Design an enzyme around this catalytic site. Structure first.
Site, PDB file in Angstrom:
ATOM      1  N   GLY A  33      56.536  10.256   9.815  1.00 50.08           N
ATOM      2  CA  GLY A  33      56.328   9.136  10.711  1.00 50.08           C
ATOM      3  C   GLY A  33      56.771   9.469  12.117  1.00 50.08           C
ATOM      4  O   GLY A  33      56.359   8.812  13.071  1.00 50.08           O
TER       5      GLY A  33
ATOM      6  N   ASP B  20      50.250  22.929  16.983  1.00 53.29           N
ATOM      7  CA  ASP B  20      50.236  21.527  16.578  1.00 53.29           C
ATOM      8  C   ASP B  20      50.425  20.676  17.823  1.00 53.29           C
ATOM      9  O   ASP B  20      51.503  20.139  18.071  1.00 53.29           O
ATOM     10  CB  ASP B  20      51.358  21.252  15.566  1.00 53.29           C
TER      11      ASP B  20
ATOM     12  N   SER C 191      56.210  12.407  13.460  1.00 49.63           N
ATOM     13  CA  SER C 191      55.270  13.406  13.957  1.00 49.63           C
ATOM     14  C   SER C 191      54.686  12.995  15.292  1.00 49.63           C
ATOM     15  O   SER C 191      54.401  11.818  15.525  1.00 49.63           O
ATOM     16  CB  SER C 191      54.109  13.606  12.971  1.00 49.63           C
ATOM     17  N   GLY C 192      54.504  13.976  16.164  1.00 52.54           N
ATOM     18  CA  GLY C 192      53.915  13.704  17.450  1.00 52.54           C
ATOM     19  C   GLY C 192      54.944  13.183  18.411  1.00 52.54           C
ATOM     20  O   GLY C 192      54.670  13.090  19.600  1.00 52.54           O
TER      21      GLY C 192
ATOM     22  N   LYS D 183      65.248  32.704   9.938  1.00 58.88           N
ATOM     23  CA  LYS D 183      66.102  32.963   8.785  1.00 58.88           C
ATOM     24  C   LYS D 183      66.054  31.807   7.801  1.00 58.88           C
ATOM     25  O   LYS D 183      66.163  32.014   6.594  1.00 58.88           O
ATOM     26  CB  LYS D 183      67.563  33.178   9.206  1.00 58.88           C
ATOM     27  N   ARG D 184      65.884  30.591   8.314  1.00 61.72           N
ATOM     28  CA  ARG D 184      65.846  29.408   7.467  1.00 61.72           C
ATOM     29  C   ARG D 184      64.466  29.150   6.889  1.00 61.72           C
ATOM     30  O   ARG D 184      64.313  28.325   5.984  1.00 61.72           O
ATOM     31  CB  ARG D 184      66.300  28.175   8.252  1.00 61.72           C
ATOM     32  N   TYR D 185      63.461  29.849   7.405  1.00 60.15           N
ATOM     33  CA  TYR D 185      62.110  29.652   6.911  1.00 60.15           C
ATOM     34  C   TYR D 185      61.392  30.919   6.463  1.00 60.15           C
ATOM     35  O   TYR D 185      60.361  31.291   7.024  1.00 60.15           O
ATOM     36  CB  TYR D 185      61.256  28.917   7.952  1.00 60.15           C
ATOM     37  N   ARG D 186      61.942  31.577   5.444  1.00 58.38           N
ATOM     38  CA  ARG D 186      61.318  32.776   4.903  1.00 58.38           C
ATOM     39  C   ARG D 186      60.007  32.301   4.305  1.00 58.38           C
ATOM     40  O   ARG D 186      59.937  31.198   3.771  1.00 58.38           O
ATOM     41  CB  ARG D 186      62.179  33.385   3.801  1.00 58.38           C
TER      42      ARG D 186
HETATM   43  B1  LIG Z   1      54.833  13.891  10.610  1.00 60.56           B
HETATM   44  C1  LIG Z   1      56.146  14.611  10.319  1.00 60.56           C
HETATM   45  C2  LIG Z   1      56.741  15.455  11.313  1.00 60.56           C
HETATM   46  C3  LIG Z   1      57.966  16.135  11.066  1.00 60.56           C
HETATM   47  C4  LIG Z   1      58.640  15.996   9.810  1.00 60.56           C
HETATM   48  N1  LIG Z   1      59.859  16.652   9.541  1.00 60.56           N
HETATM   49  C5  LIG Z   1      60.356  16.950   8.231  1.00 60.56           C
HETATM   50  N2  LIG Z   1      61.752  17.131   8.112  1.00 60.56           N
HETATM   51  N3  LIG Z   1      59.633  17.072   7.161  1.00 60.56           N
HETATM   52  C6  LIG Z   1      58.038  15.150   8.810  1.00 60.56           C
HETATM   53  C7  LIG Z   1      56.810  14.468   9.060  1.00 60.56           C
HETATM   54  O1  LIG Z   1      54.962  12.456  10.561  1.00 60.56           O
HETATM   55  C8  LIG Z   1      53.676  11.971  10.196  1.00 60.56           C
HETATM   56  C9  LIG Z   1      53.153  13.056   9.262  1.00 60.56           C
HETATM   57  C10 LIG Z   1      51.623  13.283   9.359  1.00 60.56           C
HETATM   58  O2  LIG Z   1      50.906  12.079   9.553  1.00 60.56           O
HETATM   59  O3  LIG Z   1      53.821  14.233   9.663  1.00 60.56           O
END
Ligand SMILES: *[B@@]1(C2=[C][C]=C([N]C([N])=[N])[C]=[C]2)O[C][C]([C][O])O1
Length: 237
Positions: free
Chosen positions: A186, A93, A188-189, A160-163
């Site tokens: 939000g 990613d 992300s990135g 362990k937290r992501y089976r």
């Molecule tokens: B991302 C995004 C990145 C990381 C997380 N973390 C959790 N705890 N879910 C949520 C969301 O932000 C924008 C979206 C895609 O446009 O994914």
């Protein structure tokens, strides 16, 4: 960002807010300045994005309110997505945005150093996640850039937290065993900046997680150091 606080203006000069103008302008993802014409961000951030023409990168921003129709921004000339990327949860990613113009560095906008291979043994004890993402699971894009200090967790612990998931060495997780602080929609990135010897390093890119800030559910980030070769090859002419 869940469980964080308002950032100080210019505290995270490499942080940018990536907007899309379709249908109407809005914050899409976070990003990090790593070069005069390069933003490092998350690949899954461009889902449904057919052209770089609808993208606008804003640097030196603290509050989204600062962004108006008369605000200057950087156009995106090219979106480079890792050819092995399929989806956030599977890894890879990572994406590069080649800006149409060069960023003039200043105290409000400057690049963050990429980690070096000779730093995978380095113990980052001062890492922070930033962004204008949700404060909770069902929220909205925050106005003021939020920051939250979060400890890194071993990949063994993360697995362990992501089976049901495969946490590879190309990923890196961070969070509290009890939750409370974490990235959210939000963010992300966004960068996962870590401070060693008082020298900021881009350790990870906000990628995914199960819900937000839940107990025993560490945020999952792209392990940047595993992509320095990729970054160098894609950034060279
Ligand atoms: B991302 C995004 C990145 C990381 C997380 N973390 C959790 N705890 N879910 C949520 C969301 O932000 C924008 C979206 C895609 O446009 O994914």
């Amino acid at each position: 960002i869940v469980g964080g606080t308002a950032s100080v203006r210019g505290e995270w000069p490499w942080q940018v807010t990536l907007h899309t103008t379709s249908p109407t302008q809005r914050h899409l993802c976070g990003g990090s300045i790593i070069g005069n014409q390069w933003i490092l961000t998350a690949a899954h951030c461009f889902y449904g994005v057919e052209s770089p023409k609808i993208l606008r990168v804003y640097s030196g921003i603290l509050n989204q309110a600062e962004i108006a129709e008369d605000t200057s921004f950087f156009g995106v000339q090219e979106i480079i997505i890792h050819d092995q990327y399929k989806m956030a949860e599977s890894g890879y990613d990572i994406a590069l945005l080649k800006l149409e113009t060069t960023v003039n560095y200043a105290d409000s906008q400057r690049p963050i150093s990429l980690p070096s291979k000779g730093d995978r043994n380095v113990i980052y004890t001062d890492c922070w996640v930033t962004g204008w993402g949700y404060r909770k699971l069902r929220d909205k894009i925050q106005n003021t850039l939020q920051k939250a200090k979060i400890p890194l967790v071993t990949n063994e612990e993360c697995q362990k937290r992501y089976r049901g998931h495969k946490i590879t060495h190309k990923m890196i997780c961070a969070g509290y065993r009890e939750g409370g602080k974490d990235a959210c929609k939000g963010d992300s990135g966004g960068p996962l900046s870590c401070k060693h010897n008082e020298v900021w390093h881009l350790v990870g890119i906000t990628s995914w997680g199960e819900g937000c800030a839940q107990r025993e559910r560490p945020g999952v980030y792209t392990n940047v150091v595993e992509y320095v070769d990729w970054i160098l090859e894609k950034t060279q002419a």
